[PDB]
Amino acid sequence: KASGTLREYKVVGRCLPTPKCHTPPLYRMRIFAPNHVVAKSRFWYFVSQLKKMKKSSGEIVYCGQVFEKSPLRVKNFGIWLRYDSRSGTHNMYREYRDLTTAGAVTQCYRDMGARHRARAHSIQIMKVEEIAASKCRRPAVKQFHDSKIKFPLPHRVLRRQHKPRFTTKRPNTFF
Amino acid sequence: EVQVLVLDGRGHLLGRLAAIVAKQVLLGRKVVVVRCEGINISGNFYRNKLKYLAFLRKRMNTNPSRGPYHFRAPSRIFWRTVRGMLPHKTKRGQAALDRLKVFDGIPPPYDKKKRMVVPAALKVVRLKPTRKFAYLGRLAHEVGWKYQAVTATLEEKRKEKAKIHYRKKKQLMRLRKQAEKNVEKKIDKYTEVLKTHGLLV
Amino acid sequence: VFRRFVEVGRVAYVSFGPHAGKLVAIVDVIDQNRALVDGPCTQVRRQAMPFKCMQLTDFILKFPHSAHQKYVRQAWQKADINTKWAATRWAKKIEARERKAKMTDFDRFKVMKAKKMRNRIIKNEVKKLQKAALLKASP
Amino acid sequence: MKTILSNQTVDIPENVDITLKGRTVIVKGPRGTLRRDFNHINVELSLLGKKKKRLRVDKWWGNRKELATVRTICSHVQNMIKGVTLGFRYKMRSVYAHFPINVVIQENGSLVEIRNFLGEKYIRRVRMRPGVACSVSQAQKDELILEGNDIELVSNSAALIQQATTVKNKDIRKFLDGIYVSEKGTVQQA
RNA sequence: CGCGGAGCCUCGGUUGGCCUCGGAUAGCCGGUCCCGGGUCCGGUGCGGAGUGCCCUUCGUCCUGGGAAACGGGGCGCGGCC
RNA sequence: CGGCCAAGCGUUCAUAGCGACGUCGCUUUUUGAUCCUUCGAUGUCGGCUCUUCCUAUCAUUGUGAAGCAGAAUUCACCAAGC
RNA sequence: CUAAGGAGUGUGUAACAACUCACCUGCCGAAUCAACUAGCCCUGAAAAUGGAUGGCGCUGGAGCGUCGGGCCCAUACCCGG
RNA sequence: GUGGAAUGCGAGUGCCUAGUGGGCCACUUUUGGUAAGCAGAACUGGCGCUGCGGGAUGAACCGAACGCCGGGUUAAGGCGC
RNA sequence: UAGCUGGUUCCCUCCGAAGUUUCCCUCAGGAUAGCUGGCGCUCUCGCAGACCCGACGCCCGCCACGCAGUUUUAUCCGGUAA
RNA sequence: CCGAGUGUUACAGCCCCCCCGGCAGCAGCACUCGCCGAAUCCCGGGGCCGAGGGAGCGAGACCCGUCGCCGCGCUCUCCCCC
Ligand SMILES: [Mg+2]
Ligand SMILES: [Mg+2]
Ligand SMILES: [Mg+2]
Ligand SMILES: [Mg+2]
Ligand SMILES: [Mg+2]
Ligand SMILES: [Mg+2]
Ligand SMILES: [Mg+2]
Ligand SMILES: [Mg+2]
Ligand SMILES: [Mg+2]
Ligand SMILES: [Mg+2]
Ligand SMILES: [Mg+2]
Ligand SMILES: [Mg+2]
Ligand SMILES: [Mg+2]
């Protein structure tokens, strides 16, 4: 499983009706994935680990995209995950700030690869929750919880370094 | 475009400036790099000195007069980095490498010409400010360059002749601004045409 | 040092991206890099923008963080930002910079003749002003 | 984690009137004046008051290592302020078991010379920093009394004359001889 | 010493100029009153701007009005720096 | 030729100097092991002469440690200049 | 016989040697301590001609991790002779 | 005759017959050995017989197999010089 | 004499290997079967109706055999991994 | 004028529930976030290329196959309009 920007999916599946259980229970997961072809196969990855269910004796009943129910409010996102290292596997709780839920999960996949060199197949997102500002634990998130937030943009580095490429004046960085 | 390209060396990182120069020289473009003592190298000083002293040990031990020629002026250290970015075993790269003139200080053909700056090779653009760097002029002094004292005494002499030029050039700039207030009832017609089409904010 | 601050109500000028050239207002801050951002009177709907796109101005509006659209719209309209902008020199420099770009071949001709005359008078006048400053005969 | 803001303010007494030429603190008091640049640190320095004149220093998006340089600037500025109102004074005793260490001060307190350290013939001559004046005390039998405005010059001058009297090739758990800094005080004891 | 002329041979590129502060970047630049300074006043996504500036080339004749009149032009001579 | 762990030795005291039972490495001056190259041939041990290189330092310069009082000695560091 | 207290960690001890830790309510008045774990980096890390991310070099990356849009060319694929 | 699953494909048969009978490598399974660019097997692919793009360089890796050309587009790999 | 070295002379076109089985005083060789080429032969589909043009018999339905480093559906087989 | 407390809209606002909403626009020309086109059409620019050479079932071909398939327009009716 690669990435690129994730979407949330509501995937619902159920075992095929045998002549033993005529109506098997519907199960749903919420699954972050680049698209719905990958989303339906993360479903059978996780649901094989929980119930004795393979995709041969099963069917994706529904697979639809969940849209963000307030994509303009800034939220705090608690994420519980579980990942394999070079050594054994470990549990984590991370926190982020984002406008969308899948934006926060995408931000976590980049960050688990950055800090831990965790590739995306090693990570299992197991619960993602919106947290109030009072219940947050991570001080990298909580410093933005301030109604009078104020900071400058200190040392602006020049980005257009080739337009022009040869020039006569040296760049300013104080703005 | 037949003129030469005069680049000030000061404040530029060594290998970022060198890839800029080496691509221009292969595209025609005579280029002169002046003031090569001001060229910076990132990483702290002692680290970069060791990389030059490690270079000073590579010599052909059978006959070191044939060996790697360890040039020690800052202009000729810069000249070998841009040579390493050139295909200098071919006629095309040898004809490149003599479109490049390198100088320590600023000699009297080029002291009265305005220098260019490459912003994609500057220390203030390309390094975080909490990173250590070195100077090519200092590092060449500890490896055997004889002449940083005489080059410093000739750069401080050039600058005090250049301060006198600036405050006379700036003295004409306020006479021109004085003139624009004397004549404004007879150029108000022409300063409306220029202000309409994007000149003269 | 540091006269201009990122804060709620700070009016920024979007320098690149798709909304390039639009004034916009900082509504809330996200994660050191991005800002919730709204231009109600400049056709920029509320969204997230990185701080490297935007350039801070001198204008600050007064509304609390994460207000709705209508409270940043009416804070925009009183102490009218659209008319304080295009009176600063910085919006005049932008206005001059694009009308130099949209200058046809004939308008470059009319400017060429006008500037050639205008520099004759100014150059003639500075000949007189520096030969009159040359009339100095005191020890 | 990069902290949005870490500040620390410094109170300035009424004797001293510091200025700020960018990141250069020129402190000027009754005992003279001092000057250091802090242009190897990216901070903002600003005088605050109009009657009490605090001095703040802010860091703005520092990591952990950058966040340590804030209180060092405050500590260097406070040693400037103590240095131009009270001044620095190091008393250092001369410890000897058998051979009396003879210190005689050369030209106007700028040079000391040490004669008899462990009974030998070579004469130590160690020059003070510019601004540090050394002296021989009259309160006790043998202590040097060197003093000046800047703390990093008074302390360096005590360190030069302590490392000048090193015992070589002997056990230094016996043979405890030398001149050692005994206290780090001030002139004009408040 | 001449472009002084006449012709050749051979090597080719090229297609307007920029005649100069030093530097800083967690700050710079420009004016100004009092002893190179302090004050003061401006500017700062650099407009006193290289994202710039300067030169502009159909040629003439009739003919007016502005700019000019302290000017233009001479490989003019002579001297000076 | 080094490392780690620490029962012990060191009158006391694991670790000044050591280091059992274990265990982890480096090196290619040994010899095994192999048989890739050479059998229309690479002159095959040592000494003599002569140059250069390595450091895993015997001495010397600068140091740190001790069961370093001095003397002598041992243990480490930078170091292959001589 | 206390407001909470040694048949000792604590002044290495055949010594009444002798100094005020332990436990504190006011001072100082806001968070802090520990054990783990794994990323990068460092120590561990010593060989002989002078030398090898291929080289130059690179540190707001030209390094490592996770990613996007462009783009580059094989005798492969496609259309044509 | 509803030619009794899917999918693809023309099939059968004879004579004569050369060269070969030193192989080697790689993924996975595997035996001897401390190991070996070591010795010995299984399975498939490759090199030998085979160029081309990529891995700086290379029998065997990765991509892809070749009439002589134009245009376009890719693969593996890349995009400071 | 040589089961051993060395050499073995023009061009284009098409096809294109083997270092394995069994036997041999066999292990630097041969016979043997594989792998290759050539020569065919026996059949099938059929060619397709001058330019034309899906057709022209019996409401449906059907479109030859065979064959395969393949799956499906039945059904046996096995004693590895665990 | 900043900082710290305080608590619940007040001289700002934010969240949720409604008893019910109304209008506009509508994967937006306010570049917030999709997948598509029998639910899809039109116009333009750049590049490389021109292989082939007797196509007439009609007159009995004659300067000369502007021919097959395919898609169209007019006339062998009449009226009106610009
Ligand atoms: Mg020399
Ligand atoms: Mg001794
Ligand atoms: Mg013991
Ligand atoms: Mg073998
Ligand atoms: Mg021989
Ligand atoms: Mg020989
Ligand atoms: Mg060593
Ligand atoms: Mg062979
Ligand atoms: Mg593969
Ligand atoms: Mg034989
Ligand atoms: Mg043979
Ligand atoms: Mg068995
Ligand atoms: Mg088993």
Is D66 close to B129, i.e. CB distance below 8 A? no
User: Do D59 and D48 contact (CB within 8 A), yes or no?
Assistant: no
CB D7 within 8 A of CB D56: yes
Q: Give dist(CA B132, CA B123) in Å, integer.
A: 11
Buried b (16+ CB within 10 A) or exposed e, D68-79: ebbeebbeebeb
Q: In this complex, do A171 and B125 lie within 8 Å of one another by their Cβ atoms? A: yes
**Number of other CB atoms surrounding residue D143 within 10 Å:** 20
Residues D31-54: b if buried by 16+ CB within 10 A, e if exposed: beebebebeebbbbbeeeeeeebe
The CB density around residue B112, as the number of other CB atoms within 10 Å, is 10
DSSP state, D160? H
Closest CA–CA distance from residue C102 to any residue of chain D (Å): 42
C-alpha B45 to ligand 4 mean position (Å): 55
- Strand D55-58 to strand D7-10: parallel, antiparallel, or no bridges (unpaired)? antiparallel
Edge-to-edge strands of the sheet including A89-98?
A: A89-98, A75-84, A123-131
**Residues 6 or more apart from C83 whose CB is under 8 A from it?**
none
Separation between Cα atoms, residue B190 and residue C119, nearest integer Å? 10
DSSP designation for B72: -
| Tokens 């295009």 belong to residue | C86
Kindly state the tokens that stand for C109.
Answer: 């001709």
Residue C48's Cβ-side half-sphere holds a number of Cα atoms within 13 Å equal to 17
The resolution in angstroms reads 2.8
Of the candidates A140, A143, A151, the beta carbon closest to that of D60 is on: A151
Token duo for residue B159: 């600058």
Q: How far is the CA of B67 from the C1' of F20 (A)?
A: 56
Interface test with A, best of D2, D3, D4 (most A CBs within 10 A): D4
Task: Count Cβ neighbours within 10 Å for each residue of B144-177 and write b for 16 or more, e otherwise.
Answer: ebebbeebeeebeeeeeeeeeeeeeeeeeeeeee
For residue A90, the SS3 value is strand
Q: For residues D102 and A127, what is the distance between their CA atoms, to the nearest angstrom?
A: 79
Helices B14-25 & B74-84 angle (0-180, nearest 10): 60
Placement of tokens 């303010």 in the chain = D9
Token pair recorded at residue D177: 């001889």
Length of chain B: 201
Which residues in chain D touch residue A114, judged by CB atoms under 8 angstroms apart? none
Subunits close to C (at least 3 CB pairs below 8 A):
A, B, D
Cβ distance B144 to B69 under 8 Å?
no
Angular region, A14: left φ>0, alpha ψ -120 to 50, beta rest: beta
Output b/e per residue, C43-73; b: 16+ Cβ within 10 A. Answer: ebebbbbebebbbbbebbbebebebeeeebb
> What is the C-alpha separation between B27 and A114, in angstroms, rounded?
40
3-state secondary structure of B56: coil
Which of D44, D48, D68 lies closest to D57, judged by CA? D44
D74 CB-side CA count, 13 A:
17
Q: State the pairing for strand pair B31-34/B100-102.
A: parallel
Element (H, E) at B38: none
Amino acid, single-letter form, for residue D76: H
Contact across the interface for C32 and D46, Cβ inside 8 Å: no
Whether A96 contacts chain C with CB within 8 A: yes
DSSP state for residue A117 in the 8-state scheme: -
- Residue C128 is encoded by which pair of tokens? 């007189």
Q: Please give the Cα distance from B29 to B100 (Å, whole number).
A: 9
The Cα B18–Cα B33 span in angstroms is 10
Q: Which of B30, B26, B28 has its CA nearest to residue B3?
A: B30
| Residue of chain D minimizing CA distance to C3 | D44
Rounded-to-integer distance, Cα D145 and Cα D155, Å = 12
Helix, coil or strand: residue D113 = strand
Looking at the complex, report in whole angstroms how far the Cα of residue C123 sits from the nearest Cα belonging to chain B. 8
Q: Which residues of D touch C3 (CB under 8 A)?
A: none
Q: How many CA atoms lie within 13 A of B87 on its CB side?
A: 5
**C-alpha C105, offset from chain centre:** 27
Kindly write down the DSSP assignment for every residue of B163-179, as one continuous string: HHHHHHHHHHHHHHHHH
In B56-113, which residue ranges form alpha helices assigned H by DSSP? Answer: 74-84, 91-97
C-alpha closest to that of A41 among A13, A20, A21: A13
Q: Are C30 and A73 in contact (CB < 8 Å)? A: no
Taking CA–CA distances from C2, the nearest residue in chain D reads: D44
What is the DSSP code string of B108-161? TTTTTSPPBB-GGGBHHHHS-TTS-EEEHHHHHHHHT-S-HHHHHHHHHHHHHH
Interrupted backbone of chain B, residues before each interruption (C–N > 2.5 Å): none
Distance B49 CA to ligand 12 centre (A): 69
List, as one string, the DSSP characters of C49-85: EETTTEEEEEEE----TT--HHHHHHHHHTTTHHHHT
Q: C24 and C49 in contact (C-beta within 8 Å)?
A: yes
The answer to whether B26 CB is within 7 Å of strand H is: yes
**CB distance D178 to D129 below 8 Å:** no
DSSP state for residue D95 in the 8-state scheme: E
Question: What residues have CB less than 8 Å from B65, skipping those under 6 apart?
Answer: none
Q: Tell if the CB–CB gap between C107 and B197 is shorter than 8 Å.
A: yes
DSSP secondary structure string for all residues of chain C:
-----B-TTEEEEE-SSTTTT-EEEEEEEETTTEEEEEETTTTEEEEEEETTTEEEEEEE----TT--HHHHHHHHHTTTHHHHTTTSHHHHHHHHHHHHHT--TTHHHHHHHHHHHHHHHHHHHHHHHHHHSS-----
In this structure, what are the phi and psi dihedrals at residue C83, rounded to the nearest 5 degrees? Answer: -105, -15
Please tell me the distance from the alpha carbon of residue D124 to that of residue D105, in angstroms, as a whole number: 12
Question: B136-143 vs B74-84: helix axis angle to the nearest 10?
Answer: 110
3-state helix, strand, coil in chain A (%, to 5): 20, 30, 50
User: Cα–Cα distance between D57 and D73 in angstroms, integer?
Assistant: 8
Tell how strand C10-14 and strand C54-60 pair up: antiparallel
